[PDB]
Amino acid sequence: ATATYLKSIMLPETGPASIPDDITERHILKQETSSYNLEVSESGSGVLVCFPGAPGSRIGAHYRWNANQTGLEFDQWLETSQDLKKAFNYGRLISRKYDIQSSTLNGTLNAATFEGSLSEVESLTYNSLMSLTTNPQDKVNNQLVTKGVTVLNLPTGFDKPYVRLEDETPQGLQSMNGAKMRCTAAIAPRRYEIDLPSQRLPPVPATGTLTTLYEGNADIVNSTTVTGDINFSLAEQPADETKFDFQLDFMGLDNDVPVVTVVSSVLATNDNYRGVSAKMTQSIPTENITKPITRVKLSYKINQQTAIGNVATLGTMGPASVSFSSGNGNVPGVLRPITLVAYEKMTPLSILTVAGVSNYELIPNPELLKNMVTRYGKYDPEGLNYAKMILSHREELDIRTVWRTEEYKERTRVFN
Amino acid sequence: ATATYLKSIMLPETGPASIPDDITERHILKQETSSYNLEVSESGSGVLVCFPGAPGSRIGAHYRWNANQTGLEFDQWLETSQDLKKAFNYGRLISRKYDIQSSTLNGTLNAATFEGSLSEVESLTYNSLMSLTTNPQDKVNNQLVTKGVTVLNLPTGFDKPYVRLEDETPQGLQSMNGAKMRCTAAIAPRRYEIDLPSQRLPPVPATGTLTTLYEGNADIVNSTTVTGDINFSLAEQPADETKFDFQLDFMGLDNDVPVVTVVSSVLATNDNYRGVSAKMTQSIPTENITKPITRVKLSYKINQQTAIGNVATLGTMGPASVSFSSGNGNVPGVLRPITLVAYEKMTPLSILTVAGVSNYELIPNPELLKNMVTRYGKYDPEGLNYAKMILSHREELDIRTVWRTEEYKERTRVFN
Amino acid sequence: ATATYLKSIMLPETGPASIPDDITERHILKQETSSYNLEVSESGSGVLVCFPGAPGSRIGAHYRWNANQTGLEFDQWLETSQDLKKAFNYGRLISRKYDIQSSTNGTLNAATFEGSLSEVESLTYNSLMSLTTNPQDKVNNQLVTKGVTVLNLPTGFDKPYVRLEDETPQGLQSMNGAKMRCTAAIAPRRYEIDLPSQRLPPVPATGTLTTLYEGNADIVNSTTVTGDINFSLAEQPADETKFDFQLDFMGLDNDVPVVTVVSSVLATNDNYRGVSAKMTQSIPTENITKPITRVKLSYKINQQTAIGNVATLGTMGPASVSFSSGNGNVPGVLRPITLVAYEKMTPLSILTVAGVSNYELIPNPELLKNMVTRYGKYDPEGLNYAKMILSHREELDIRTVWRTEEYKERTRVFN
Amino acid sequence: ATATYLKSIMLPETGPASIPDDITERHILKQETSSYNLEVSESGSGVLVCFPGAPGSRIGAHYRWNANQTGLEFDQWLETSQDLKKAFNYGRLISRKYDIQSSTNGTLNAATFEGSLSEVESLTYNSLMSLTTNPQDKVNNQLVTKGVTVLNLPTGFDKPYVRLEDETPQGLQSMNGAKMRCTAAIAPRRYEIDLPSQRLPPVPATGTLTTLYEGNADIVNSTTVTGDINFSLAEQPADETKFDFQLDFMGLDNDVPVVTVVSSVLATNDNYRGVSAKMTQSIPTENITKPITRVKLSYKINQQTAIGNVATLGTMGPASVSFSSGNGNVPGVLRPITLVAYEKMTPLSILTVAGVSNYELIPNPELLKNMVTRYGKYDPEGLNYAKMILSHREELDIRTVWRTEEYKERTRVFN
Ligand SMILES: [Cl-]
Ligand SMILES: [Cl-]
Ligand SMILES: [Co+2]
Ligand SMILES: [Co+2]
């Protein structure tokens, strides 16, 4: 009775099995069903972004192509029917599976499992998905939308820690209306940093106009903390006290429209013009991340004509650098890897149906603890080895992260 | 010779055994004895808080009920005879056991192992402990103080990392008197965040009076780092430059008296009234946490009459949010889980004796390294599996985190 | 030859097998076929409510979403082709199975809830998935073309022969339309409404209904109401006023009473210290025209000279009205239910539901003249076998809710 | 692996084991701990009443002797730490055990009576010993220091899931304090009071209560009263008189009504040939503030011009009032009980009672969202094993009442 773990990995519909590794905490086993009926735009094109390894209850994201095939338009997150953070404080993901097809009655599907973050993808062309990976069993090309594509999560490492889901804490009554405190994702964060040279800021074209300093790719998906010190010195005493504003912009795949903006400003006086420091210290909560963030933009703007010719050098107070750290970022599964499923040439106004199944190991919140029993995992000495071995000969056999649905169906019942 | 690990888990008095998992670093094995003779107040009531899984040398906390059964009065930390951080830089906890009884020759004991943090407990009533968990072998009710209760730590997961104890670093002589730098708990932090709505601050009743914005539950037990940006904008140019003060208060279970307070203030000038930002950046050392912290309180106060009617909106500069991250917080054992032992109807002025035993895997500090040999753990291939299996059938058998002392005594010598 | 019982449980289409438990009465075995071609509204949405364990001949109920997705509109009961109570007086349910698909674009959500219909929080297509955690008790986003199969997994054995509600022999001198029936009586479900020993909320106006209690409750067959809503007025009534107490029984939809019942008293000088309005009605089944899921107790008065007259409730004994329905707590009758929601179906299309039920029945005295009754086949290991498969129900994949194409294949293992 | 059930029966501290009988519904297993530190009165005497088989969360009741040994004074119910009806709708009791001793001089008598609390003739410390003859159902003069253990030996298997009395979802327009609950309904216990078809005893005076019947009866949860106390007067009432009928429910002690309920009629010229006072009340459970062990039906009138007016009873049909309590006849609920009397204890000392109960429960729809339900473990020989040990219960020494020090040792034979 060891094939239990692998069965859950391969046939998530089956239900949960405790993970037979070294992280044996007392827990609960729960299955989660996600149902999504998506509408296709005039273009009949779109991209489906899965986070097959994500412990959270945000497991995907749907994008559409505008009729002109010019860019993408974010539709919605793909979440779980149930908001897990209302009932549990901690969780690991045991196994997951997306079933993608059309529930109408024309159209095809490209699917590939990219072994990096969403922002690390060069292109999202329907055709360019096929070069996100070379592993034959990590992609599927031109599968009829009728027949369907199945997305299976093959463990991206074992012995992964219980992540803290982002539950809300007990409050006092004298609290602001709408204010709440939560115990957020903290463990093993992903940290990006923006490094500005010890030289002069590019000059503003005009007053009150934003001049960009850095733009680049980066992945934020939950609560983030920004720490930094963009410092500088002006060459001359400011004729008039001018206001330097520094904007950090977080945009998604689409439309350059900030998902979240944050600002820090200093006044350049006679008193400090030798070492002005604009300090970044913001903590961006998760409810603010209304769509996947894939790029950052650091810009600045000033306040006075008597400042535009005043050369500001950057290195003065210590390195000019702004960093941000997101919880759980580097936990395998959270941002990496992803599975892209692109659909094209679908009949407009039709429905692309996505059915999800997720199996977790969870730790009930103190309220549920009153009635719910917690148990150490079933005793499974060979369970993990068996999985290590099948994933080992994953290429000889044909174990896939991306399947042609009709195949996943048949070649699967070998695990019962 | 594999039962060695389990023997240490079940009979900590026996002594230490290296943990037979994947984290085989060169180490030392040491046993620690903690002796505590506590005095009972007039009320004959009190609560004992154990952190059975804690790697530190703070393993408990004693609270008393005031004669009126109104609230609790913090007594003291339960620590180890020896301050480990003076001799070692790194440690994991192998196994631990508290022995609680009366050393006088009337009274009972309730005990339950809660699978969350101290602040996540709804009530600390003697009777309400029994609904902190449903697992029969995680609680014990109405045990005579004479007979005693035994608290055993059942591993809350294996493969846990060597935490950094908080040692003091070599200094230079030209240093302040009393100033020191330490290498603190850093790994896998627990991070709480306070999310203020993008709306207006509640109005102060008067000048120099503190108006609360948020109060709630949160657990800090060692060094913490606060990062945030409580920003806002006033509706009108301030008639007079007013001083906004923001107080972050950390209180314990009792008496609302701040364990540690921290403040950040800005001046609202004509220059900045469109985007005032009060920045949180403090680093609260551990020696400042004089008692268990279980709740936070964010309040603000102003400076001028000409400001009380000046509506300050919050969303202006980016989300109004303050977060704090404590090292080791999410390392299993550090804050979760806890074991509560409540005593009531004890003869006042009597002594409740608590004897502790802890077994560690430690890494000697460079001074002790000169003379102390470090070794890889004994070779124990089946050691961990054996433990996984007993904890597996933990309910069939009767392996407990909370025992009736007389039972733990007998049913234990089966492990020699 | 023991797998007979389990075969019937898993493949009801097969036919009936006597239940191999301790309730061996002389009986008959009969299979029942139910055929339903339902029409979909403009909204292409709807909810299908099954009572997989019900001994009666009412085995389901169909609801539709109004084009606005605002609320539900009751369509009809799902009954058996044959009215069993015309031929039999007693019955247990051996096994049952619903086959749901389209006989013409659209999906299906299905979950087996382990409580009564009224105990369901929400009937959203998406909210069905959180009615149970048991993986094999739900199925999400199944194409209406492929179909969903609803299997009844025994909710306990040794369940008693319930009395179907047959009509009794009459005399000729009886009213036209009046009849007496031997109704469901055994192991009833009993709800009670408990009013505090304080004052009734004041009527806004004369002849206007002011509600006292509204809440959820499940009635599905004959009910008996017993109660004593008593009170006392603070002052002698200026004029003799008429207190009316309405007990309303509504369904999932539209607040329109399925059955209303009233009791009224006159507050005189004679009794104002202890007025008692007594509930005593017996609501027959033919009156339950659709599933009842909530109750509403309200009252109204008669005089202006009474609106300021504070009526306190505790006076005569607790102010409480209770009602008891026969068979209510027999497992299968009200609990558990299986919900199947359909959405995004082409309007004016047909959602076909085919049902199969196997009973153990006791023929009515007329059929007894010609029909032989027998003790069940001797099946010593029959019940244990079933207990064991349901035991490892999760290891294996035995379901109350199937993807039809799977139920088809994975089933022929039981022949 | 069959001894699982019996282990739970004998060592309830161990934890729950699904009951291996024919009532296999999908369920949950939960253990419940009850802790009670009782204070002894000046008399050092008292009686402990256990309901070892009760599915509810009311598992006992403590009485004290007044310093004069004249009568008893009710102290409190013995309940479970946790109110089960807030989390579960249905339950059976798997096994239970009380541990009774002093946590500080004194002795204990204990006997398991195989009937209801009201059916006990006397509660003398010494008279407990003649409540049963079965040697292993009683224990005499056990030191309070050493302690007495009360074990529940199954009083029958195949017992049905009783409905715990949960509160139902409400509407907001409801009275403040009013709620409706799904109460105990199954297999009720029904007492009836039968008044002869003769004349009511005459009132000594106006407005004075004259008793008609007093007797023993056991109510412990929600009750429904149905009746028709009818009569006819010999002469047209000189003045319209008000007949009041009081039904009183008292406990073991002090004659002070736990719950009173009244019904009254006016005797007019119009009806004096057949006056009927109708009983219709539904007494909720929150009203049963202490164990009820006796009923008292009395009546009082209103006029001098009525005291000589002979009222005969048989007129309208039998003069009879009945009441039916849910679950009453479910074994364990009212029968059997275990009495533990303590005497000669040091006043102001504490008699500590520790309880353990193991249930099979069905989570309420809210808990269903997250809690898995399972059919019981497959245990073919489990029940037989228990039937057999209880069979040779006398040869061996399996007890409902133990000397604690013995129960401790002779128990670990079941691990
Ligand atoms: Cl970390
Ligand atoms: Cl019944
Ligand atoms: Co390992
Ligand atoms: Co049987």
Q: Where are the domains of chain C?
A: 1-186+330-415, 187-329
Ligand approaching nearest to the C-alpha of D382: 4
| DSSP strand pairing (C46-50 vs C337-343) | antiparallel
Tally of CA atoms within 13 A in the half-sphere of B29 that contains its CB: 16
CA distance A30 to chain C (A): 7
> Which residue ranges of C are tagged as binding site?
21
Backbone angles phi, psi at D217, to 5 degrees: -165, 150
Rounded-to-integer distance, Cα C28 and Cα A338, Å: 60
Query: Is A87's CB within 8 Å of D370's CB?
Result: yes
- Chain C residues lying within 8 Å of D282, measured CB to CB: 192, 226-228, 318, 320-322
Q: What is the CATH architecture of A1-187+331-416?
A: Sandwich (2.60)
User: Is the minimum CB–CB distance between D53 and chain A shorter than 8 Å?
Assistant: no
B144 touches chain D (CB under 8 A): yes
Task: Give the Å distances, CA to CA, from D265 to A57, B32, C230, D213, D309.
Answer: 66, 82, 14, 19, 16
Output DSSP code: residue A129: G
Query: b or e along B99-116 (b: 16 or more beta carbons within 10 Å of the residue's beta carbon)?
Result: bbbbebebbbbbbbbbbb
| D178: nearest CB among C196, C276, C388 | C196
Judged by CB atoms closer than 8 Å, whether chains meet at C394 and A105 is answered as: no
Q: Per the structure block, which two tokens stand in for A398?
A: 């044909």
Q: Determine contact: A381 vs chain B, CB below 8 A.
A: yes
Q: How many residues does the structure list for chain B?
A: 416
DSSP character string of A271-339: TTTTSEEEEE--EE-GGG--S-EEEEEEEEE---GGGTTS-EESGGGS-EEEEEEETTTTSTTTSS-EE
Alpha carbons D141 and D143: distance in angstroms, whole number:
6
Chains near A with 3+ CB pairs less than 8 A apart are B, C, D
Q: Using the beta-carbon criterion (under 8 Å), do A87 and D372 form an inter-chain contact?
A: no
Cα distance between residue B378 and residue B24, in whole Å: 10
Mapped to the 3 state alphabet, what secondary structure does chain C carry? CCCHHHHHHHCHHHCCCCCCCCCCCCEEEEEEEEEEEEECCCCCCEEEEECCCCCCCEEEEEEEECCCCCCEEEEEEEECCCCHHHCEEEEEEEEEEEEEEECCCCEEEEEEECCCHHHCCCCCCCHHHHCCCCHHHEEEEEECCCCEEEECCCCCCCCCCEECCEECCCCCCCCCCCCCEECCCCCCEEEEEEECCCECCCCCCCCCCEEEEEEEEEECCCEEEEEEEEEEECCCCCCCEEEEEEEEEECCCCCCCCEEEEEEEEECCCCCCCEEEEECCEECHHHCCCCEEEEEEEEECCCHHHCCCCEECHHHCCEEEEEEECCCCCCCCCCCEEEEEEECCCCCCEEEEEEEEEEEEEECHHHHCCCCCECCCCCCCHHHHHHHHHHCCCCCCCCCEEEHHHHHHCCHHHC
Elucidated via: X-ray
Which of B107, B141, B144 comes nearest D35 by C-beta? Answer: B141
Measured between beta carbons, the chain A residues lying within 8 angstroms of D372 are: 29-30
Contacts A104 to C, Cβ<8 Å: 105
CB contacts of A86 in chain C (<8 Å) are none
CA-CA-CA-CA dihedral for D247, D249, D253, D255, to nearest 10: -20
Span from the CA of A325 to the centroid of ligand 3 (angstroms): 29
Q: Name the one residue in this structure whose structure tokens are 């846990």.
A: B160
Distance B22 CA to ligand 3 centre (A): 5
Q: Which helix (H) or strand (E) is A62 found in, with range?
A: strand A58-65
* Dist. CA A287 → ligand 1 center (Å): 23
Q: Is B205 on the interface with A (CB under 8 A)?
A: no
Q: Does C121 touch chain A (CB under 8 A)?
A: no
Neighbours of B (≥3 Cβ pairs closer than 8 A)?
A, D
Interface contact D371-A370, CB threshold 8 A? no
> Which residues lie below 8 Å from residue A27, measured CB to CB, with a gap of 6+?
A18, A361, A362, A363, A374, A375, A376, A377
What does the alpha-carbon distance between residue D354 and residue D147 come to, in Å, rounded to a whole number?
A: 11
Under 8 Å between Cβ of C220 and D209:
no
Order of strands, sheet of B260-268, starting from the edge strand that comes earlier in the sequence: B211-220, B293-301, B242-251, B260-268
The residue ranges of DSSP E strands in B252-350, in sequence order, are: 260-268, 276-280, 283-284, 293-301, 312-313, 320-326, 338-344
Ramachandran bin of D119, using left for φ above 0, alpha for ψ from -120 to 50, beta for the remaining angles: alpha
Candidates D408, D339, D396, D401; CA nearest to D148 is: D401
C-alpha closest to that of C149 among C266, C8, C52: C52
Please give the interface size between A and C, counted as residue pairs whose CB atoms are below 8 Å apart.
Answer: 51
By CA distance, what is C115's nearest residue in D? D365
Compute the distance from residue D188 Cα to the ligand 2 centre, in Å: 6
A362 Cα–ligand 3 center, Å: 21
Q: Is the peptide bond prior to B155 cis by the omega test (within 30 degrees of 0)?
A: no
Q: Which of helix, strand or coil describes residue A22?
A: coil
- Token digits for C267? 């507050």
Q: What is the CA C175 to chain-centroid distance, rounded?
A: 30
Half-sphere exposure of D383 (CA within 13 A, CB side): 16
Residue with tokens 């109510």: D219
How many other β-carbons are positioned within 10 Å of the β-carbon of residue D160? 22
Q: Which of A21, A262, A363 sits opposite B115 (nearest CB)?
A: A363
Fold annotation for D1-186+330-415: Jelly Rolls (2.60.120)
Q: Is D367 in CB contact (< 8 Å) with chain A?
A: yes
Rounded-to-integer distance, Cα A307 and Cα A265, Å: 15
Burial class (CB in 10 A: 0-12, 13-18, 19+), B186: middle
- Distance of CA A223 to CAs A154, B216, B320, Å? 26, 19, 13
Q: Is B176 helix (H, G, I), strand (E, B) or coil?
A: coil
Of B283, B273, B281, nearest to B231 (Cα)? B273
CA of B365 to the centre of ligand 2 (A): 75
User: Are D154 and D192 a contacting pair, CB within 8 Å?
Assistant: no
| Exposure on the CB side of residue B235, measured as CA atoms within 13 A | 11
CA A305 to chain centre: 42
Nearest to A395 by CA among A137, A131, A20: A137
Instruction: Please give, rounded to a whole number of angstroms, the shortest distance from the CA of C14 to a CA of chain D.
Output: 24
Beta carbons within 8 Å of A283's beta carbon, 6+ residues apart: A223, A224, A225, A226, B193, B227, B228, B229, B319, B321, B322, B323
Q: Given CB atoms, is D362 within the 8 Å cutoff of chain C?
A: yes
Total Cβ atoms within 10 A of residue B309 = 10
Chains meeting C at 3+ CB pairs closer than 8 A? A, D
Among chain A residues, CA nearest to D366: A368
- If one counts every other C-beta atom within 10 angstroms of the C-beta of residue C365, the result is 9
Q: Determine, for residues D87 and A30 on separate chains, whether the beta-carbon distance falls below 8 Å.
A: no
**Cα angle B255, B256, B261; round to 5:** 135
DSSP conformation letters of D42-95: TT--EEEEE-TT-SSSEEEEEEEE-TTSS-EEEEEEEE-SS-GGGTEEEEEEEE
CB C251 within 8 A of CB C123: no
Helix (H, G, I), strand (E, B), or coil: what is residue A101?
Answer: strand
**Interchain pair D15, B395: CB under 8 A:** yes
Closest chain A C-alpha to C61 CA, distance in angstroms: 24
CA A167 to chain centre: 18
- The first and second tokens of residue B260, run together, are 């540690």
Cβ atoms of D79 and D338 closer than 8 Å: no
SS3 D390: helix
Rounded alpha-carbon distances, angstroms, from residue B4 to A1, B7, D172: 27, 5, 62
Going from the Cα of C159 to the center of ligand 4, the distance in angstroms, rounded, reads 11
Domains A1-187+331-416 and A188-330 share a fold: yes
Is B347's Cβ below 8 Å from some Cβ in D?
no
Task: Let me know: does A261 contact A247? Beta carbons within 8 Å.
Answer: yes
Determine phi and psi for A386, rounding to 5 degrees. Answer: -55, -45
Q: Which ligand is nearest to the CA of B327?
A: 1
The fold for domain D187-329 equals: Jelly Rolls (2.60.120)
Q: Which residue of D has its CA nearest to A364?
A: D370
CA–CA separation, A24 and C193 (whole Å): 48
**B211/A297 Cα distance (integer angstroms):** 37
Closest residue to A351, CB basis, from C127, C130, C344: C344
Which of C190, C316, C388 minimises the CB distance to D326? C190
A95 touches chain C (CB under 8 A): no
- Cβ-based burial of C124 (10 A; exposed 0-12, middle 13-18, buried ≥19): middle
D114, two tokens: 């195989």
A411: CA distance to ligand 1 center in Å?
40
Interface contact D33, partner B, CB < 8 A: yes
Look at C140 and A31 and tell me if their CB atoms are within 8 Å: no
* Lookup result for tokens 């889980």: B337
Please identify, in words, the CATH class of the domain defined by A188-330: mainly beta
Beta carbons within 8 Å of D198's beta carbon, 6+ residues apart: D312, D313, D314
Q: How far is CA C29 from CA A79, B70, C333, C385, D335, in A?
A: 49, 69, 20, 21, 38
Chain A residues with beta carbon closer than 8 angstroms to that of B194: 179-181
If we measure between CA atoms, which residue out of D315, D292, D324, D353 comes closest to residue D79? D353
Query: Where on the phi/psi map is residue B47: left (φ > 0), alpha (ψ -120 to 50), or beta?
Result: beta
Closest CA to D151 of D413, D415, D411: D411
Residue C276 has its nearest CB partner, among D225, D263, D373, at: D263
Q: In angstroms, rounded to a whole number, what is the distance separating the alpha carbons of residues B53 and C296?
A: 54
Structural element, H or E, at residue B40: none
Q: Which residues contact D121 (CB under 8 A, 6 or more apart)?
A: D127
d(CA B169, CA B187): 18
Record the tokens describing residue A141, joined without a space.
């090309």
Q: Searching chain B, which residue's CA lies closest to the CA of residue D99?
A: B142
Let me know: does C102 contact C345? Beta carbons within 8 Å.
yes
Angle (CA) D89 C60 C192, round 5°: 35
Alpha helices in A188-238 (DSSP H): none
CB D19 within 8 A of CB D5: yes
> Looking at chain B, which residue has its C-alpha nearest residue A169?
B217
Contacts of A374 (CB under 8 A, 6+ apart): A26, A27, A28, A363, A364, B115, B133, B135
Q: What is the spatial distance between Cα A233 and Cα C216, in angstroms, rounded to a whole number? A: 71
- Number of C:D CB contacts under 8 A? 212
Distance from CA of A379 to the nearest CA of C (A): 16
E-strand spans in D82-238?
88-102, 107-113, 138-143, 148-151, 162-163, 166-167, 179-183, 189-195, 210-219, 223-233
Cα separation, D169 vs D86, in Å, equals 12
For residue A368, which residues of chain C lie inside 8 Å, CB to CB? none
